[PDB]
Amino acid sequence: KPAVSVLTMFRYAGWLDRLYMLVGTLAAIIHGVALPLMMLIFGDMTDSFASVGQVSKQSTQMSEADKRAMFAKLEEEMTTYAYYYTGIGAGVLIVAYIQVSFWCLAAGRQIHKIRQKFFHAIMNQEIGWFDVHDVGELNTRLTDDVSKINEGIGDKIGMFFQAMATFFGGFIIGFTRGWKLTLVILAISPVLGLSAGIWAKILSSFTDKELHAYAKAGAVAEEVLAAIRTVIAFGGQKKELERYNNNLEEAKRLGIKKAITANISMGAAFLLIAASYALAFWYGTSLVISKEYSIGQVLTVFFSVLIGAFSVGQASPNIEAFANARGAAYEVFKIIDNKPSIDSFSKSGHKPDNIQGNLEFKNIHFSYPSRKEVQILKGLNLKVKSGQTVALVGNSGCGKSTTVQLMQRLYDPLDGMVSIDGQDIRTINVRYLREIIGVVSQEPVLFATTIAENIRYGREDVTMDEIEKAVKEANAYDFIMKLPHQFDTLVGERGAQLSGGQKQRIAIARALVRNPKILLLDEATSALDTESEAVVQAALDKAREGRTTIVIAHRLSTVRNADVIAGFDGGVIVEQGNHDELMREKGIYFKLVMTQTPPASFWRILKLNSTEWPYFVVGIFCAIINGGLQPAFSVIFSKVVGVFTNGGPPETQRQNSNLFSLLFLILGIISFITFFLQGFTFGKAGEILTKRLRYMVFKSMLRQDVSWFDDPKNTTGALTTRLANDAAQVKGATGSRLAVIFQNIANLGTGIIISLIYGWQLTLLLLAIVPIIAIAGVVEMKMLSGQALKDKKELEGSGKIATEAIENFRTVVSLTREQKFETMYAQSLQIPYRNAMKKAHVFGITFSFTQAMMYFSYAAAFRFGAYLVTQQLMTFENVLLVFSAIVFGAMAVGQVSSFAPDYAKATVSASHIIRIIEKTPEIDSYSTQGLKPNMLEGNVQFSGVVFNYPTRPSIPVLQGLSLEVKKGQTLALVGSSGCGKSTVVQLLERFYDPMAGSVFLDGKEIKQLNVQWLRAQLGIVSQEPILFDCSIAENIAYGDNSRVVSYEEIVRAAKEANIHQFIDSLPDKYNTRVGDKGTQLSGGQKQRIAIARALVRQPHILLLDEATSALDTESEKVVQEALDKAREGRTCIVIAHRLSTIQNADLIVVIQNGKVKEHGTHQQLLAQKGIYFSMVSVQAGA
Ligand SMILES: Brc1ccc(Oc2c(Br)cc(Br)cc2Br)c(Br)c1
Ligand SMILES: Brc1ccc(Oc2c(Br)cc(Br)cc2Br)c(Br)c1
Secondary structure: OOOOOHHHHOOOOOOHHHHHHHHHHHHHHHHHHHHHHHHHHHHHHHHHHHHHHHHHHHHOOOOHHHHOHHHHHHHHHHHHHHHHHHHHHHHHHHHHHHHHHHHHHHHHHHHHHHHHHHHHHHHHOOHHHHOOOOHHHHHHHHHHHHHHHHHHOOOHHHHHHHHHHHHHHHHHHHHHHOHHHHHHHHHOHHHHHHHHHHHHHHHHHHHHHHHHHHHHHHHHHHHHHHOHHHHHHHOOHHHHHHHHHHHHHHHHHHHHHHHHHHHHHHHHHHHHHHHHHHHHHHHHHOOOOOOOOOHHHHHHHHHHHHHHHHHHHOOHHHHHHHHHHHHHHHHHHHHHHOOOOOOOOOOOOEOOOOOOOOEEEEEEEEOOOOHHHOOOEOOOEEEEOOOOEEEEEEOOOOHHHHHHHHHOOOOOOOEEEEEEOOEEHHHEOHHHHHHOEEEEOOOOOOOOOOHHHHHHOOOOOOOHHHHHHHHHHOOOHHHHHOOOOHHHOOOOOOOOOOOHHHHHHHHHHHHHHOOOOEEEEEOOOOOOOHHHHHHHHHHHHHHOOOOEEEEEOOOOOOOOOOOEEEEEEOOEEEEEEOHHHHHHHOOHHHHHHHHHOOOOOOOHHHHHHHHOOOOHHHHHHHHHHHHHHOHHHHHHHHHHHHHHHOOOOOOOHHHHHHHHHHHHHHHHHHHHHHHHHHHHHHHHHHHHHHHHHHHHHHHHHOOOOHHHHOOOOOOHHHHHHHHHHHHHHHHHHHOHHHHHHHHHHHHHHHHHHHHHHHOOOHHHHHHHHHHHHHHHHHHHHHHHHHHHHHHHHHHHHHHHHHHHHHHOHHHHHHOOOHHHHHHHHHHHHHHHHHHHHHHHHHHHHHHHHHHHHHHHHHHHHHHHHOOOOOOOOOOHHHHHHHHHHHHHHHHHHOOOOOOHHHHHHHHHHHHHHHHHHHOOOOOOOOOOOOOOOOOOOOOEEEEEEEEOOOOOOOOOOEEEEEEEEOOOOEEEEEEOOOOOOOHHHHHHOOOOOOOEEEEEOOOOEOOOOOHHHHHHOEEEEOOOOOOOOEEHHHHHHOOOOOOOOOHHHHHHHHHHOOOHHHHHHOOOHHHOEEOOOOOOOOHHHHHHHHHHHHHHOOOOEEEEOOOOOOOOHHHHHHHHHHHHHHOOOOEEEEOOOOOOOOOOOOEEEEEEOOEEEEEEOHHHHHHOOOHHHHHHHHHHHO
């Protein structure tokens, strides 16, 4: 919404840039004007053949006499025109170069200037400006918004004035040479803009319906795949498939209805567009029989108008490129024009010599850019004597750290003044101020150069002698020399990561070359290992005594030798003096001392599509007819102008022109009829395989075992996404692109035959010319992409050192040296600049070449069409035909290169979708094999079970686990932590077979037992019961599948679960909807319902996995009261974390490290004193 003044945007265009644009826009206008003139001459050549075409047939008497005056007219005329076109092509060769070259030159020259000014502006902003902005958005604003500016002031402007030239020069020749047809062509324009407006309304309203249609099926998939362990537990795998299959049926019917309506839309749209033209051209014919126009002029205005009319559309993208470049230039120029109060690039203020370093802060009130929300300094008074070293202590607020900020004049105070020597800090140069202040901060930062270079960021003029003394004077010399490459080592975020106390000494050496008169030491010893701290601390003490120093730290070790110590309380200075004095004061300082002491030929995807042997053959056959039908319009056009250039006697003409225009419209309606079919047929054929794919995939997905859904690679969202995309992508490959790619190869095929068999070696010429300009148009775009990738590679090297500069900013400004990064970024940009110069000559040559090879190609089209062909006995009417036939058949093949990614994007989406069906599990619920025992009673026999989870085969959970529980008993299961408690329930449910050992139920190993039958006698109840969106009676009836459960039977379960209080309390009762879609209710209810569906099954084994986990107060007492009634009549395994409710259990088992450690009845384990009695004691007390 915000934008820029048009002149301010080119403020950096001066002298030549202003000329380049003027000459560029000039030749651009010349380039545009060139095309409608090309059409104007195409009318005069018709007139030439038309006068001879009328007189040659008018003879029917003399033959040799027509070999004289006729050919003489032709050779003076045709050579005059051919001489004229050859000139036009040389014109576009020059102006198209001038057009694109100059604008890309002015763009490159300016964008170089933008970048430099704009990075200069970034480094010039005071710190308070950064505290309110994100540096990351800023740097991306650097590389992206400048790119958008380049796109707008580039060669697009030349294309714009080229297009307006075609537009203006279009209707000028349109109006002057024939004003009537223009108004007639504009009259059908609202119809063409109204038919394409029905597309913006149909597409935008139906693309939502499908995204709503599958969102009903994709919602089924998401509550299933999220609750997958519950559907697997109760074996609703046939229902949840069925229940997704039923939503796929509706998505199919809505998909065929969309295929019917959308194909009715296209066909009617084209048939209105084509009829609109043909009426404007038939009524072109009505004006030649009346002698208001020449047969040549009708063409001249008809093309020049339609050329200029479509030239409007070909200019619209360049407008939006200019405006976006303006809007992008706003926030950029806003940074360049913005002037600071502090600078640091300013050459102003005093530069005191013989600085002695007496510092005082007077009544400083300050607040960071958070402003009125917080005020961190409520007045202040502090002097530090020259040579002395003052230490600042504080409990919190870190108002300590603020004084180092103000002493650098990173910000100015709200009220008060900071004074170095006698002068206010605001009178001294900002740069000289920071050159007389050395700074060592908590986190040290080192730039990605050599050690000597990071030290060289202290001062630019320095010799390895002074680097050596500096590092040796910060005892950092002994420790780099051992490191290889000597001073020539590397540092940075990337490469040679060092010890913290080692990085700080390089920072101390960096600040030491600064020979500062003032020293600021903020938190430097803090957050550092204890032993290297003393190594650094020796350097800090060796860095002082030549300087006045303010130091801030939480290490009270460094503070004793400070000449004065100062404590803060709420930004107010409270205590000051020597260490001993503050201790006698017994205040804040004393109080803090005591405290601290694979693309491949996949045919099988088409073999599954072979479910419909018809529906394709209908579309293909119907597409090829549409293909062969489409040049016949060019054949009609060729003979509407043909017979009427070849007229002779004029009485018969008016009667035929009505006949062709009729045929045309019969040929368009038979084109409508065939194009509805080829769309509907593929549409239906695509939507039905969409179901089969999503059915078989969702079937095969319910076939894998829990081992697969635990994979971090496969989550519920990633599976629904994999489910939707892959099915839609393969639909597109077999859908429109294939009907179109066969319609078009039939288009060119039925066109090339007509052209080849009519014109001899005429067609053989055009088949030498057209492929070359097509290839030359491709190699242009390859070179285009190559230059694009290359410039991206070498401007990111600049933006990379810009990245380093700006997100490490507060350090660089503390060291000054902005002019360093300033110069480095300039040297970095100098390569893309001198590269951007070559870009202009390259784009100009290529574009001018492809334009010239289009104009020269058509000079050869007529000079060969006449002369050697028309001095013979071949006819203009065919040359017209071969043009439209070949040229349209070629531009119809241009759709093949556009639908190419729809094939690859589908094959890749196919690549996964064939794998996902064929993958078979270790434990398949679908296998009908298994024992299905007859005897009812249930044991559980864990024996030597070692188990590790397939996702994390690192820490074992179960290793040598052995349990046995009789029928009708409760097996209490206590654990130190982890799923060692829970893995038992997962292995009995056979979510996994154990690594070693075995688990048995009735004496039979479950591993050889039937998988589905096994789970059918299991009453699993988890800690968070997931309930699908449906009737609570149906969430309950979900406990027994393969059979519909009686109402009184699901009532019996709700009676058991003690949930029947709601189930009548609701207005709907058992038919109320739950799942946080129809109704919401708390967890105690959800849980009871899960108990209800558990015991609908009438299991022989309950499995209670921390059922009271998320629950509170009386809700626990009632759910436990339901669980305690559910057991005592069944085999039970309970791992609930309430050991008070576990006292009345028949056997308690303690799990240690996957081994069973300690077991027995409650009082038995309570008589023993160990883990279980440590467990019961810790909760009962707490
Ligand atoms: Br009559 C008549 C026939 C074709 C005309 O131009 C074409 C041409 Br040439 C090809 C196709 Br496909 C559709 C149309 Br409309 C015109 Br304008 C008038
Ligand atoms: Br786009 C384009 C369309 C026709 C052009 O010249 C003609 C013209 Br004018 C008439 C016929 Br028939 C074929 C061609 Br090719 C040119 Br040059 C460019």
